[PDB]
Each structure stands twice: as C-alpha cells, then as structure tokens.
Design a protein around this ligand. Structure first.
Ligand SMILES: O=c1ccn([C@@H]2O[C@H](COP(=O)(O)OP(=O)(O)O[C@H]3O[C@H](CO)[C@@H](O)[C@H](O)[C@H]3O)[C@@H](O)[C@H]2O)c(=O)[nH]1
Ligand SMILES: [Mg+2]
Length: 502
C-alpha cells in the first residue's frame, strides 16, 4: 500500500495534477489494471496524453477518458510494455488503435536490406546475450588490459548476461591461449575459436585471410567486421564492440526488445546544409555496426545472406567500392586496379609507401595529380617535375619542392610529415568501405535509400516518414543497453586507432 501510494503519485504527476476532472475517481477506476510500467505511457509527450487533453475540452470527459484509458491500457499499452515495446512504438500502436482520437498518416513503405520495414513488433531480440570479438595482433597477448576490464565491467553491470567471445587461437602462442581459456572460463564467457567454425558462408575464407595476412595488408577489425554476417556465429542476441559500456538504467525488465526488421543496427541521422533547388535541408540516416541486434527468426538468416553476398562481391572487386575514396586518386591504385591486385596487396602497398621515407617513392605512389595536391604545387610546378622525374634523385626532387613554396634533412622531414598526415584518410576506407559500416550501409540500401528531405512534425514522434520509420523500428542502439558515441545522434545538424597499421 506504499506500492499503491507510489502508483497513485505517478498517475497524478503523469496526468499533470489536472482538476478539469477528478483524478481520484479516475485512478480508483483504473487501478485494478494499472501498473507503474503503464503510467510512463500516459505522460506529457505521449499520444495517450495528447488525446486526454482533447477529451478534457469536451463534454462527459470523466467518463470518456475513463473508457479510453481502460481500453488503451488493457488492449495496447500493457501488452506493449510486457512485450518490450518502446514509448515510440506504444505511441504508434495507440494512434493506430484510436483513429477517432488521433489523426495520423499511413506507415510509409520503407525497404531495409531487401525487407519492407514492419510495424507489427514481430521480430524479437534478446538483450541478455552478447557477443564480442578480439583478434590479437600480438601472439604474446591474448587481450590487452583495457579489453579485459571492459568484459569484467559488463558482467557486473549486466549482471546475469551471457557473454560470448570470438577469438583466433592460431593468432596466439600456447601460453597466450592457455591464458585466454583461463580468463573466459573464469569470467563464465563462452569462447568461440574462429579457426574451427562450421559454415558455408563465403565470408569465412575472407576472415581467415584477413587474419592470415596480418603484416601483409590484413586487418583484425576487418575480420571482426565480417564475422558479424555469418549465421552460424550470430543468430540471436547482440553483437557489441568489446569496449562498449552498458547503461544499466536502460536494461529492460524482460531482457527483450522488438523491431520491424530482423537485424537492427546503431543508427542516427545528419541534417545537411540547405541544398538546391529549394534551399532545403536533407536528413540522411547514418548507421554503425558497433551494435547489431539479431532476431530469433528465420528472416534473420535471409537478411544476413543479402549482406554477406554484397560483402563477398566487394572483396572480389574492391575497386568499385573504393572509387570515391582519396586513395582512388592515386597512381598506385590505378595500377593495382589494372593488375587486379587484391585488398591485402592494396593495403600493404599503401602502408609500404608511407613507411618508405622516400620522396621519390611517394611521388611514384601518389602520381603527379595527387602529389600536386598534397604538396600544394602550382600546375606549372608539377608539370616541370613530372617531365623530369626520371632524371631526379631524392635531393633533386626536394630542391624543387623547396623553390616551389637551409636544413635539407629537416626539410625532408617536414615534407614527409605533410604527406603522412594523409595516411589515415587513404587507409580507413580500405576497411570501412570493404567490411565496415560503409559497405554495410550500401548492402542495406545505400545513401540514396536513406536520405530524404527533412520534415519536422508536431507533438509525439510517429513513424510516418522513412527516417522516422528507421528511428522507431530499426535502431538497436536506442533500444539496447549499450552505450556508443561512434556516430551522430538522431537528427544532428551537420554543423554541430587500434586498427591503423603504424
Ligand atoms: O587489434 C584489434 C583491434 C580491433 N579488433 C576488433 O575491431 C573492433 C573495433 O575496434 P575499435 O578499436 O573499436 O575501432 P573503431 O574504429 O572504434 O571501430 C569501428 O570501426 C571498425 C572497423 O570497421 C568496426 O569493426 C567497429 O564495429 C566500429 O565501431 C574491436 O571491437 C575488435 O572486435 C580486434 O579484434 N583486434
Ligand atoms: Mg571503438
């Protein structure tokens, strides 16, 4: 009866302590069927709240509001709270259930990974089953302290979750592997050795190659990226970057959320500057793969395979995926493409060029156009160099850079450092557009498909435009208990690395 008093207090707050009706008798008439969980969906900002405010202005409001709430609670809100529905999702379900009280548009047709997004709430996701991945580039170290501590932290902050960890035993020496096994079974972590997994995925040999090629153009984050689209590895729960903190205040009582597609990702959006021809801003949905939720459903494998086939296509021919990256503007890239060098040779060659400490090698790598841009040379200046490059030694090239603008050793370092600060921009797309969030965004439908002219609405958010549909039904970040600031939040105005090889 403190329990009753608490419930009563929440109800009176939720409904704004109004006296245009008698909240005492309303409460008393709903309390047989009123839980704390339900009251959240009666608060200002809710669809249910908005209807109450309109009913208040009318005759017979006491009775009309009671019968509205009795049904809305029993038929819509309570079942939705139990099911793991969000406030957004319950708001839409209330609007749909009461068109006489809430005017609203149809669910727009939005496709996402070849699936039409639904509002049925039918795909279900476990928040208590979580899988992370650590592939070590140092055979002596199973996992650094930071990653170990993150895992310990999660077990405590989540306090009965099931943690699975994918790793590679062949990347570790025998003592490191002994340490890994001790760590996992001590932490009650389920270990999965990537080295010996049974699957028909075309992504499996690609993972093995990324890892086998460490030091020769392979990348451990790219391997981790790819594992996430293999059905034998991910068929329920969440993928989460090993380093993501849990926000315990976000853990839902039933350890279950729902979605309108069978695979949800971290999402947000960016509101562009005005564009032609109406000088109007566009909202472009952005996504990230640091948090992925997988439905306990057959449709999960189907959607997963669409993505996997796309990833396979990219690895087979990465030059198309990379066509608008800074690296695409280089002589080296154009040669690699003619030669059909693969992704590993492409990454290793970039790495080699920036390890070279040779202005001449860098010239050959960049080609005159990019070299001109990196060194801010006039057209006539690059023309002279390029006409005579076959005659130059290193000092020759440096003397020309200097005049185009007394320690030749320090000057060399200065110019080398100027080039080096482009390395990151050249390299990152060789993962992000190949296995990472860029490739995945494209596999799920691409820029076009996820951009629309920015519309801002009145009152409670409903899934009535494409980005709203994605925000309401497809975003694993806001529904799950994991924290990430890796991408923009939803509706962010455009105006507001462990895996980079040294
Ligand atoms: O030595 C390493 C370094 C990274 N990783 C894996 O790669 C992931 C991402 O590493 P992180 O240092 O977090 O890189 P970020 O740039 O923050 O990660 C972003 O970019 C990566 C590359 O596409 C994706 O794997 C991530 O999900 C995405 O959040 C890690 O969680 C691990 O799974 C390893 O396994 N071994
Ligand atoms: Mg990270």
């Amino acid at each position: 009866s403190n329990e009753l008093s608490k419930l009563r207090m929440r109800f009176f707050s939720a409904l704004n302590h109004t006296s245009e009706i008698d909240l005492h008798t309303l409460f008393d008439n709903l309390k047989s069927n009123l839980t704390l969980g339900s009251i959240e969906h009666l608060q200002e900002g809710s669809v249910t709240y908005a209807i109450i405010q309109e009913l208040l202005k009318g005759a017979d409001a006491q009775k009309k509001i009671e019968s509205f709430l009795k049904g809305a609670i029993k038929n819509v809100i309570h079942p939705g709270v139990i099911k793991g529905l969000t406030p957004n999702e319950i708001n839409w379900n209330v609007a749909k259930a009461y068109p006489e009280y809430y005017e609203h548009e149809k669910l727009p047709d939005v496709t996402f990974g070849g699936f039409k997004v639904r509002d049925s709430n039918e795909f279900k996701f476990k928040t208590n089953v979580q899988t992370s991945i650590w592939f070590s580039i140092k055979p002596e170290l199973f996992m650094p302290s930071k990653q170990q501590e993150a895992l310990k932290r999660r077990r405590e902050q989540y306090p009965g979750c099931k943690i699975r960890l994918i790793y590679s035993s062949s990347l570790l020496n025998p003592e490191a592997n002994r340490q890994m096994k001790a760590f996992a079974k001590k932490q009650n972590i389920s270990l999965i050795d990537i080295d010996s997994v049974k699957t028909d995925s075309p992504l499996y040999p690609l993972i093995k190659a990324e890892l086998a090629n460490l030091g020769m153009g392979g990348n451990p984050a790219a391997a981790s990226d790819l594992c996430r689209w293999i059905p034998e590895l991910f068929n329920e729960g969440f993928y989460v970057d090993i380093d993501l903190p849990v926000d315990s205040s976000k853990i839902v009582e039933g350890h279950q959320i729902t979605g309108g597609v069978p695979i949800m990702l971290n999402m947000g959006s960016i509101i562009s500057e005005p564009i032609a021809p109406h000088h109007r801003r566009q909202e472009a949905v952005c996504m990230n793969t640091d948090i992925i939720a997988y439905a306990n459903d057959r449709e999960t494998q189907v959607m997963m395979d669409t993505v996997a086939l796309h990833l396979k296509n990219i690895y087979d021919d990465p030059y198309t995926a990379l066509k608008d990256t800074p690296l695409a503007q280089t002589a080296f890239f154009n040669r690699c493409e003619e030669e059909g060098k693969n992704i590993f040779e492409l990454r290793k060659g970039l790495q080699d060029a920036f390890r070279s400490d040779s202005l001449l090698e860098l010239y050959v790598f960049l080609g005159p156009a990019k070299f001109k841009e990196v060194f801010k040379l006039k057209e006539t200046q690059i023309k002279y160099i390029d006409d005579h490059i076959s005659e130059f030694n290193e000092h020759d090239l440096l003397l020309h850079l200097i005049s185009d603008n007394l320690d030749f050793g320090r000057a060399k370092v200065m110019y080398m450092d100027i080039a080096k600060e482009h390395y990151s921009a050249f390299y990152k797309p060789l993962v992000e557009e190949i296995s990472g969030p860029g490739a995945i965004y494209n596999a799920l439908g691409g820029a076009s498909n996820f951009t629309t002219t920015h519309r801002r609405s009145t009152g409670p958010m409903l899934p009535t435009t494409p980005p709203r549909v994605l925000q309401v039904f497809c975003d694993a970040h806001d529904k799950g208990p994991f924290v990430s600031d890796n991408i923009a939040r939803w509706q962010t105005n455009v105006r507001e690395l462990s895996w980079l090889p040294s």
